[PDB]
Design a protein around this nucleic acid. Structure first.
Ligand SMILES: OC[C@H]1O[C@@](CO)(O[C@H]2O[C@H](CO)[C@@H](O)[C@H](O)[C@H]2O)[C@@H](O)[C@@H]1O
Ligand SMILES: Cc1nc(Cc2cc(F)c(O)c(F)c2)c(O)n1C
Ligand SMILES: [K+]
Ligand SMILES: [Mg+2]
Lengths: 225, 215
RNA sequence: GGACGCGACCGAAAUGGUGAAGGACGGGUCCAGUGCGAAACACGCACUGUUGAGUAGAGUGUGAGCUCCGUAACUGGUCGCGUC
């Protein structure tokens, strides 16, 4: 019954502003403390801000003090995080959390939203170039052959990858994106397949990058040699 | 002064059914205002324990917490498959709140050698001025692995990046990509591109290579 | 000896004024901690604490007691005097 949905995330340039929303359902925020907590990719949870019930008192981590303002609108049963003068290092998934009822959960945060990704960068939005990783003319490694797709130079996160429109799932490994020195992301998605069917089977990677209105389908074939 | 929560170990490999303990050490008194959370990849944290030792409603009793002064422990009495995840302590005694840096709990299994594959850059990419060469290490265990690049036998350094999957849901193996980036010009100056893989499961290090012109 | 009456001295419930005492005379208020109220602070309640707090009060009590100066009911004691 109890749920939190955060929204408003996206790409902003350093110095820019962004307002996040945390829409509650199944409870009324007025009876609870509400918190924002963030997690930069590959890093730990970092407490950002909170607002206390009844008094409206607000608290902030030093890292965001003076730039961020947390608020609560009871009419929309929604909390907000207003972020000004954003910096590269503010990049993270932003979660809002309910601090639970004292008698039942002490000061534990008992419910969390799914999170919303905030990207702060000077880099411009850009869809990926997709390149084949061709199955080798050679025989085998580990019993099979391997092929895939290189999804290079997109921004910002995320991109999704599937194979044969979701029909091919076994043996698929899609790697976590890596931020390149260019400040663009890149990743590969690979799959292992029988080596004997490389000519008569079709393998297509479906790459979707919503922020740039880019969706590409690349057929991956053995190279001409 | 801000309160520190020093968490250890930062990672741990265990078998299903094992008893594990994760510790967080506060740098000042936090009374008993310590909570523990579980986080799976791509998901929000979930509350397990509050006030140091109280089990959050609906959380299985194999999870327990204890306080010894300013040291706090989360114990899983007997790990089940779904318990593999990252765990975080949090002090909320005073503002600002502090989180421990986390403990990743991963599943042990038998050693598995990587299957190795190398991929030359496509012609399409080349005609755009950059060459990406990819080395794939597939379905191995444990995580620890060494991948180095050689071009015409010269050891590369600083021009490759690695990425690794989360432990696989079925076989508990890892897969890893290493990507060597070169300008088109540098790439065309050389012939032999090799990646060399060292791993506990291999009888001896494995080299996968191609010659630039030939495929 | 006794009783009644008058008066004086003493005592005295009660009352006005006075000036010292701080937590072992209290209450109030504040402060701290803990728990609770859908509640970390602010607000309210409960519990705990004076090796927590001014006897210049920082009180819409400086309230009770006392120190010290008066008024004083009397069912009080004593002495004198008048009378029986
Ligand atoms: O606000 C910084 C503060 O948060 C902690 C956790 O309480 O660290 C978090 O934020 C850091 C980013 O500055 C991350 O590097 C770290 O992984 C994350 O847990 C504290 O350690 C830090 O003082
Ligand atoms: C300074 C001040 N103290 C109090 C009361 C008080 C002080 C103590 F020290 C105690 O022990 C005690 F029981 C009561 C006030 O009302 N004010 C204004
Ligand atoms: K007093
Ligand atoms: Mg209070």
């Amino acid at each position: 019954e109890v749920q939190l949905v955060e929204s408003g995330g996206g790409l902003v340039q350093p110095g820019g502003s962004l307002r996040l929303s945390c829409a509650a359902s199944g409870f009324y925020i007025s009876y609870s403390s509400i918190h924002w907590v963030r997690q930069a990719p590959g890093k730990g949870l970092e407490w950002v801000a909170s607002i206390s019930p009844y008094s409206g008192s607000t608290y902030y981590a030093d890292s965001v003090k003076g730039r961020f303002t947390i608020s609560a609108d009871t009419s929309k049963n929604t909390a907000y995080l207003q972020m000004n003068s954003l910096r590269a290092e503010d990049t993270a998934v932003y979660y809002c959390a309910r601090q639970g009822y004292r008698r039942r959960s002490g000061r534990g945060f008992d419910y969390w939203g799914q999170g919303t990704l905030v990207t702060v960068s000077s880099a411009s939005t850009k869809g990926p170039s997709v390149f084949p990783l061709a199955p080798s003319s050679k025989s085998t490694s580990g019993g099979t052959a391997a092929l895939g797709c290189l999804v290079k130079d997109y921004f910002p996160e995320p991109v999704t990858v599937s194979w044969n429109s979701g029909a091919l799932t076994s043996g698929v490994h899609t790697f976590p994106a890596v931020l390149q020195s260019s400040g663009l992301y890149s990743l590969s998605s690979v799959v292992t397949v029988p080596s004997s069917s490389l000519g008569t089977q079709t393998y297509i990677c479906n790459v979707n990058h919503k922020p740039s209105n880019t969706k590409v389908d690349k057929k991956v074939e053995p190279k001409s040699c | 002064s801000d309160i520190q929560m020093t968490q250890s170990p930062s990672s741990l490999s265990a078998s299903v059914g094992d008893r594990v303990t994760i510790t967080c050490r506060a740098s000042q008194s936090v009374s008993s205002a310590v909570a523990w959370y579980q986080q799976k990849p791509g998901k929000a944290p979930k509350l397990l324990i509050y006030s140091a030792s109280s089990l959050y409603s609906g959380v299985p009793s194999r999870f327990s917490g204890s306080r010894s002064g300013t040291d706090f422990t989360l114990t899983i009495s007997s790990l089940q498959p779904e318990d593999f995840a990252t765990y975080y302590c949090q002090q909320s005694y005073s503002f600002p709140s502090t989180f421990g840096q986390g403990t990743k709990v991963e599943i042990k299994r038998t050693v598995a050698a990587p299957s190795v594959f190398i991929f030359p850059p496509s012609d399409e990419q080349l005609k755009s001025g950059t060459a990406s060469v990819v080395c794939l290490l597939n379905n191995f265990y444990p995580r620890e692995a060494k991948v180095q690049w050689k071009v015409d036998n010269a050891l590369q350094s600083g021009n490759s990046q690695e990425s690794v999957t989360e432990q696989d849901s079925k076989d508990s193996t890892y897969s890893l990509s290493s990507t060597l980036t070169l300008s088109k010009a540098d790439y065309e100056k050389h012939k032999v591109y090799a990646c060399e893989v060292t791993h506990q499961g291999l009888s001896s290090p494995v080299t996968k290579s191609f010659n630039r012109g030939e495929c």
